[PDB]
Write a protein that binds this ligand. Structure first.
Ligand SMILES: Cc1cc2nc3c(=O)[nH]c(=O)nc-3n(C[C@H](O)[C@H](O)[C@H](O)COP(=O)(O)O)c2cc1C
Length: 147
């Protein structure tokens, strides 16, 4: 199954989770593409991928505000061609802030609405991939069984 991993990250935290996910999905025998949202275009983004693992950090306090590079792609998610594709969300956050990993339910709610099949509950972590290695491992195991 060809998997795209799309992330937006300002200090590298969601980026490190995405890199770890690529390593683990790839090792399960999949063709995996790592793409930074900064270099991505939403129109027909999902074409030829069977699964899209998307993730980003949130940057608002009382309101949810997505990471600068992922926020336009989020907005144009209807253009991506997600219908009938398998999808999972991930994010780095900080529990001191309101909307702790707010991008995960927002991406899930929107991808569900667009006809994507969300295959598991999104990963929510504090800090980077090495601060909680078991949850990143466990979530990857989870998407590998569902692919
Ligand atoms: C102004 C500001 C707003 C933030 N808002 C949130 C938030 O709404 N939810 C959350 O989980 N974290 C929030 N954070 C914490 C960051 O999301 C966390 O440090 C960051 O996700 C790590 O991001 P990265 O993966 O993009 O490097 C905020 C941080 C700053 C400075």
């Amino acid at each position: 199954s060809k998997v795209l991993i799309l992330f937006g990250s300002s200090t590298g935290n969601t980026e490190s989770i995405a890199q770890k996910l690529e390593e683990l999905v790839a090792a399960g025998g999949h063709e995996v593409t790592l793409l930074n949202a900064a270099e991505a275009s939403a129109d027909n983004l999902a074409d030829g991928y069977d699964a899209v693992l998307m993730g980003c950090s949130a940057w608002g306090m009382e309101d949810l505000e997505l990471q600068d590079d992922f926020a336009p792609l989020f907005d144009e998610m209807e253009n991506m061609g997600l219908k009938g594709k398998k999808l999972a969300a991930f994010a780095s956050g900080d529990m001191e802030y309101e909307h702790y990993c707010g991008a995960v339910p927002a991406i899930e709610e929107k991808a569900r609405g667009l006809g994507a099949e969300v295959i598991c509950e999104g990963l929510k972590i504090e800090g980077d991939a090495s601060s909680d290695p078991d949850a990143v491992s466990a979530f990857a195991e989870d998407v590998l069984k569902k692919l």
